[PDB]
Amino acid sequence: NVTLNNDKISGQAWQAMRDIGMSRFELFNGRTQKAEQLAAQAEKLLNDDSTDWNLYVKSDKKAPVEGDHYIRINSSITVAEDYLPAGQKNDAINKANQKMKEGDKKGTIEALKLAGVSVIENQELIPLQQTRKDVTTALSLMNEGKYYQAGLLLKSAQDGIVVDSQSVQL
Template identity: 50%
Template sequence: RYVVINATVALSEDYVATPEKESAIKSANEKLAKGDQKGAIDTLRLAGIGVIENQYLMPLNQTRKAVAQAQKLLKSGKYYEANLVLKGAEEGIVVDSEMLVAGN
């Protein structure tokens, strides 16, 4: 099982600004501020704007085990080893990228 710990939404690299697209972006931002991601994506799709979403996923069970192990090491005064265990957990984070809307 993975848990989303962060996500970003960005315009695709081939984006070229036009007044219509700027208006669509403003409208999409307003929808995102209200929590309407689907409405925002639909607005951008209609304007032909490519959008990329990155989700940062943490493996839940692996991270829990690493944190528990790090806590034991900290109680034993093994700070360096605890840091290495936590660093290993951090390196287990996976980035999932998805093109949500195909650009023109």
């Protein structure tokens, strides 16, 4: 999957974050071996040597840890709708629908503007190396039997998700 500007989004890292959350829950659910399985899957997804992780980096964003980078894991849309008289807006939305049919992203944004609709793209990002470290260290803590401490690191990984919301400039 790609952003509106055609930058690649990591589905593997998205699934890894899903696995991290499920792993943390299973620690409290009395299923620590399931938690290890889920964290192990997240580790494999984030460290896949056949994946070119450069493809997912958001270059213009400084990560908290030196030498790390944020990668894109999801994109969503926020619309903001101005008030328009019902007739004028129905007409402009019809033109927006044509541009979406045609695959014309720029034309869609422009037609939506005529409909009183602004578009914001919300890019969900994680720091790649910091998240990798959380997962591998959490598994090590699970190996040692320090399950609560592992859960803290899995929560830390989730709390490292940020959302860059940016106006659409195509």
